[PDB]
Structures are given as C-alpha cells and as structure tokens.
Amino acid sequence: ATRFKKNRKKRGHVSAGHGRVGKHRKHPGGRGKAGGLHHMRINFDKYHPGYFGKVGMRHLNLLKNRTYCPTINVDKLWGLLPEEKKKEFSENKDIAPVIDVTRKGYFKVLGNGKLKHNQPIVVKARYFSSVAEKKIKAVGGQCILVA
Amino acid sequence: PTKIWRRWGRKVNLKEKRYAVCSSIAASGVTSLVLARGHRISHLKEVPLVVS
C-alpha cells in the first residue's frame, strides 16, 4: 500500500506538495481543538453549531438497562412471521396470529405504517403506542400487555 | 522505527471467503483455466477429474 501513497509522486518536487511559501510547520494553528471560540470559531460555528455550553440536568448514574426499549412499528408485525403462515392466517378468517414481540426482542410497539384491512392480529408487548393500539383494534385485533 | 503494532493481519468477511473458495473450485473445474495457471494437463481425459 505504501507504493500507492501520494507522497511518492512528489519525490523530486522540493516541497512535497506542502507549499513553498506557507511550508509544513508543526501545529501552526494549535493542537487538537485549541482555537475554538478564538480563531477556529468560524469552523466551529459553521460545522458544529451547538458545541459550546451546557443544557439540561444531570443524571448522576444512568443504568441504561432500566430504560432499554427496542421498538417495532405495526407495519412489520405481519412480516415477523413466515410467509406460509402469513398466507394461512390471511386465508382463514376464523383464527388470528398472536405475536409476542418481546420474544423477537422488542419492548414497545409503535404505530407507523399500514396494517392489512380486516385481518385480525393479537400483539403482546410491554409497551404500546396510542396510534399503534388504535390501528391494532381498527383491523380487528387486540393489544395484550405483558411483562 | 518499525513497530510490532503494525496491522499485520486482516479481517476478511466470512461470506467473501466462502465466495472465494467456491469460485476457486469452479475455476479448477474448467480446463482452460488450469492450463493457463500452468499445469501440463494436455494429456488428462477431463479437468474435473475424480478417482476411485
């Protein structure tokens, strides 16, 4: 990989592509994020707007396991289960699938997307969106709370 | 100075490795490719040759 490097093609060019006037010096602007708010301020404000300052209150120790909550929208509930069983459930109107999304790894069911019309489906989840539940029972299904 | 923490090895995707092995077997299965690689096979009966 070292023979594909751009410095190789400037082998006999004196300045190595770094300029004859400005030269390549050692940290001519500072080190790291040195000049923020002083002479790199234009860069900071143009590319990282809200960088300086603090907002909000502290959460002293977090324990992300408490609030871990993967989500799934209602438009993927039918795609969760295999194609042949999807065909069977759609064909037979006397029975409906009850899907435990927690086993697949989802805690909350969100309401984005379109469910199939007149296809009942029961969903078991730890949390439900209001619109998700509305669509579930609009297509004739039911939401079941589990823990 | 050369250091021991150079990137000596590479991580290759398992799917790409399996693809490469399958392609190598397929290439070994065609007579012209073996001859091109340099094996003197002008006298064998067939290039996917198998024996008892």
Binding site: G32, K33, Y47, N65, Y68, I95, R103, G141, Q142 | -
Partner: protein
C-alpha cells in the same frame, strides 16, 4: 482543525506506547487451554471436568426473559434433590450460599435439574469393589458390571449446558376470543399515574402491619 470533520476526541495524550499490547498468541493460547482441559479430563479418568450449574434468570428488565447458568444451587434446591451441600460438592454439583429462591418456578426447575443429574450419575466405588449405598444424598455405588458397561459409552455432556428455551413467539387463537374492549395504552397511562399513591398505600400498610 479544518473542514467538516467530527471534532477530534483521541485520548492519546499520555505515554501510550508503553501500554500498547497486541495478541500474537490468541490461537496459541486457544491450543494451550484446549490441551490443558484435555489433559485434566484424561487425568480424572472418566468423570467429566464440568460441574453442574443451576438455571437462573438474568437480572434487570433488559434480560428478564433470558435464562443462563448461575453459580451454585441453593440450599433449598439441594434439599429438594435430597442432598447436603457438602456431599453435593463432592459429585460435581456447584453450591452457593448466597442465592435464594423467591419463586416456586425457579425452585422446582432447579430441583428437577438436580434430580435429572442424580439419575444420570453412576457412582464409582471408593474402595475397588467395596460398593456402598452412599450418604449425604450421594447415590448408591454402582457395581462392577454396570461400571464396565457404562465406561465405554459417550458421556452426557448436554446436561451441563444451559437449556434451550421453546420459542412460542408465534401462536394462533380463535377470532371470537379476541377482547375488543381492552385499552392497553390507557391502562399503561393509568398505572403510571396511580403508581405514586399506591406506593403510599403500601407504605401505610407496612406501617400498620409493623404493629
């Protein structure tokens, strides 16, 4: 800094070349550990080097649904299996004094696991054809013929592994059994709203029961 890059964050402001280390011997160590465990399972002469561990439930709401291997069966589980901790630790059963069985489900599941292990056990006499019926819950000692005929049969190492769970993430119910009046979102919201006063009621119940 320049252009539209992420702001640098590299924590390399100390003497890090002294702390760099690269594992050239990962697979060599793999081989060494494999060789060591093969050597000790040859040394102990038939008895597996693995020890039985209980099936426990992972803590926190993240891993609530998942089970794994805990360390040590509880005193209650060992008693349900009919053996003392001191005797159990001599036949490859791990025991810990810290865990407690808050649920009958865990108690019975680990007890049945212990019973299955006990039934799978075949005991080699301590004194070379001086078979005895054992103490502390240790099973009665097997005799010469069964020991000979079972020594040349593959050991059941699947019992030591954590059990696979049946996955009924799919199932079917009859449409007429669908409750069309339930309101899951409203139930969740109401439970959250009422949590504070019910904790108050529970505290008052505890104070009353304290007398």
């Amino acid at each position: 800094v320049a252009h539209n890059n992420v702001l640098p964050n590299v924590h390399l402001h100390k003497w890090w070349q002294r702390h760099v280390r690269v594992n050239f011997s990962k697979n060599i160590k793999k081989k060494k550990r494999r060789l060591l465990r093969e050597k000790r399972r040859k040394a102990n002469g038939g008895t597996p080097i693995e020890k039985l561990h209980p099936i426990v439930h992972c803590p926190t709401q993240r891993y609530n649904f998942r089970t794994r291997l805990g360390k040590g069966f509880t005193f209650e589980e060992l008693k349900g299996a009919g053996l003392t901790p001191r005797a159990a630790q001599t036949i490859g059963i791990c025991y810990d004094k810290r865990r407690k069985n808050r649920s009958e489900e865990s108690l019975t599941k680990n007890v049945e696991r212990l019973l299955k292990y006990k039934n799978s056990l075949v005991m080699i006499p301590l004194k070379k054809n001086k078979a005895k019926k054992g103490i502390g819950g240790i099973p009665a000692d097997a005799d010469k013929n069964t020991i000979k005929e079972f020594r040349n049969k593959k050991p059941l190492l699947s019992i030591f592994k954590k059990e696979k769970n049946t996955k009924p993430f799919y199932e079917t119910i009859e449409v007429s059994k669908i409750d069309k009046e339930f309101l899951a979102y409203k139930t969740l919201r109401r439970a959250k709203l009422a949590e504070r006063r019910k904790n108050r009621r529970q505290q008052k119940k505890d104070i009353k029961f304290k007398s």
